[PDB]
């Protein structure tokens, strides 16, 4: 029965958002389809990968008939996207085919029963809060580069989301470097901490358009839900005990360095050219008001950069993966950086010299 006629512009962003969780090589064919449901004056569109789902609701201002089906996602999006601006897309189901008509364009797509479409299991929310999309995008953007990709420690292949007092915090680490960002959200929250999978952090990130809707978060025991306007994202959580970030932050650093973010970045970036392609190690020599960065490779090529910095303390030599340092400096889109050290075998804390909302911890290399 299912019938609806909707404007092209009312389907485009929804079809692109619900196709988000979809992988290129689905294990089950239905997993490459979108669930279409007409109920009352609403059309709902769902996309899943079993670990996460995206739902979009579209208001039906034209005659429609209730029903459901599943239809190949990329093909349906491409048909809609390909139609002219303002096109009126008339959809109707004709057995195991869903007909799409607009102007003199006609398409017949193959369907899979709506009844076969996968459901995420029901759950109970424990923590609920609202925040501007921009706060969530800045919390993610500040830390995401530090998550592990496909680590042994599967609880690192994601980002920790932690609530404490009136703050939302994200932590991301791969065991070699860490990133932590905290933002006040204006609401008192119960202390809760969950691990969001890296694929879900990416999906959550992509649903943050810009505004005229706040973000409503619901955290459960094994799920996280994000509502933004007419979109609802749900993800399963990572079942693991995230390591404590509060113990990896240098407990009492005695050495403090200050430098211009861009001059420090540009030197590291030049020294990196002549560092080992695989290991990317650079040497840092700190002495009174000066930093020397050296790099060399198996070919015995060498780079050296000398900089004026604000440093008063003991001279020290420390090794680093230059990519981890460059990642931090490019994250810190600021004027000045503060580096806090202890010794050559211990982590360094890097932050904006004028903001503590984000802090980065990089573990050294020996030579």
């Amino acid at each position: 029965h299912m019938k609806f006629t909707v404007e092209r512009e009312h389907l485009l962003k929804p079809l692109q958002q619900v196709s988000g969780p979809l992988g290129g090589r689905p294990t089950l064919p239905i997993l490459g389809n979108l669930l279409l449901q007409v109920a009352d004056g609403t059309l709902s569109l769902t996309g899943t990968d079993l670990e996460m789902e995206m739902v979009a609701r579209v208001a039906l201002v034209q005659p429609h008939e209730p029903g459901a089906t599943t239809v190949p996602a990329r093909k349906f999006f491409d048909i809609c996207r390909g139609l002219p601006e303002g096109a009126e897309i008339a959809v109707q189901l004709e057995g195991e085919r869903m007909l799409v008509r607009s102007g003199r364009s006609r398409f017949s797509l193959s369907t899979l029963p709506a009844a076969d479409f996968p459901n995420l299991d029901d759950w109970q929310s424990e923590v609920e809060f609202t925040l501007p999309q921009a706060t969530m995008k800045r919390l993610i953007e500040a830390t995401q580069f530090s998550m592990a990709h496909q680590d042994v420690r599967y609880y690192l292949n994601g980002m920790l989301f932690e609530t404490e007092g009136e703050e939302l915090r994200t932590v991301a680490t791969d065991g070699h470097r860490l990133a932590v960002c905290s933002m006040p959200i204006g609401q008192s929250l119960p202390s809760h901490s969950v691990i969001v999978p890296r694929k879900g952090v990416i999906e959550l990130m992509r649903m943050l358009d810009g505004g005229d809707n706040p973000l409503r978060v619901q955290i459960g025991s094994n799920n996280i839900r994000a509502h933004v306007g007419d979109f609802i994202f749900t993800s399963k959580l990572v079942d693991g005990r995230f390591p404590d970030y509060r113990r990896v932050l240098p407990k009492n650093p005695d050495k403090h360095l200050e430098a211009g973010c861009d001059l420090l970045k540009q030197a590291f970036a030049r020294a990196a050219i002549l560092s080992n392609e695989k290991f990317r190690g650079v040497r840092l020599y700190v002495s009174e008001n000066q930093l020397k960065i050296t790099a060399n490779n198996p070919e015995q090529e060498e780079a050296e950069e000398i900089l004026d910095v604000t440093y008063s303390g003991a001279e020290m030599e420390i090794g680093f993966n230059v990519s981890y340092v460059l990642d931090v400096l490019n994250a810190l889109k600021c004027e000045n950086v503060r580096m806090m050290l202890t010794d050559s075998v211990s982590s360094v804390q890097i932050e904006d010299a004028a903001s503590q909302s984000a802090a980065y911890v990089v573990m050294p290399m020996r030579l």
Partner: peptide, 6 residues
């Protein structure tokens, strides 16, 4: 290396 945080 390289050393680990944890």
């Amino acid at each position: 290396x390289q050393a680990d945080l944890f």
